[PDB]
A = this chain, B = another copy of it.
């Protein structure tokens, strides 16, 4: 009866945008797997923080399904996500079974690369807007967190807490989110 979250971690990911959702989701009792795109080896994030994944993406793919698939940002991380055929397969399957897809900052741009969620309202980092909107396949929002159907997006490192709590609210409900939020000492 435990919800499961997959966080996909590639070289160049924004480490804050990775650790904050992972931590918050585990405070909410979600089973999170931090899966390394390239294997089980340690991953050098964008600001040189180095994180050891729980599993390779190949292994974690076999222990699905997941209630949420999480795509962190960071410009080089999103590009690695956008180029990976394993990500495409994971996202297409998640879309088909109507599971949640969550992406933050530059992360949403992998959705475009993989033709995921066309027609949805999404947000990105302001610096990633032109890229996400190439072709007019989505509608752009400047809300800090945006959710349209099964696509949940958010804007940058400083929205990471709101993004994570929104995932918690979607999976476990508003009261768990409120209970997890209080000890964090957030402003709003």
Query: Judging by beta carbons under 8 Å apart, are B48 and A51 in contact?
Result: no
Q: How large is the interface on A (under 10, 10 to 19, 20 to 34, 35 or more residues)?
A: 20 to 34
* Interface positions of A from 117 to 154, Cβ below 8 Å from B: 125-127, 144
Check A186/B158 contact, CB under 8 A, given A26-B48, A50-B51, A51-B49: yes
Q: Give chain B residues whose Cβ lies under 8 Å from the Cβ of A125.
A: 183, 185
Query: Judging by beta carbons under 8 Å apart, are A50 and B52 in contact?
Result: yes
Query: Does A184 interact with chain B (Cβ within 8 Å)?
Result: yes
Query: Does A47 interact with chain B (Cβ within 8 Å)?
Result: yes
Q: In the assembly, what is the distance between CA of A188 and CA of B144, in Å?
A: 13
Query: Does A16 interact with chain B (Cβ within 8 Å)?
Result: yes
Q: In the assembly, what is the distance between CA of A155 and CA of B23, in Å?
A: 17
Q: Give chain B residues whose Cβ lies under 8 Å from the Cβ of A22.
A: 15, 47, 49
Query: Judging by beta carbons under 8 Å apart, are B144 and A159 in contact?
Result: no
Q: In the assembly, what is the distance between CA of A17 and CA of B20, in Å?
A: 9
Query: Does A39 interact with chain B (Cβ within 8 Å)?
Result: no
Query: Judging by beta carbons under 8 Å apart, are B16 and A20 in contact?
Result: yes
Q: In the assembly, what is the distance between CA of A15 and CA of B156, in Å?
A: 18
Q: Give chain B residues whose Cβ lies under 8 Å from the Cβ of A48.
A: 26
Q: Give chain B residues whose Cβ lies under 8 Å from the Cβ of A155.
A: 185
Shortest A125–chain B CB gap in Å is 7
Q: Give chain B residues whose Cβ lies under 8 Å from the Cβ of A27.
A: 47
Q: In the assembly, what is the distance between CA of A156 and CA of B155, in Å?
A: 22
Shortest A17–chain B CB gap in Å is 10
Query: Does A90 interact with chain B (Cβ within 8 Å)?
Result: no
Instruction: Please give 8 more A-B residue pairs, beta carbons under 8 A apart, in addition to A19-B19, A158-B161, A187-B188.
Output: A15-B22, A42-B42, A50-B51, A51-B52, A125-B185, A126-B185, A155-B185, A159-B185
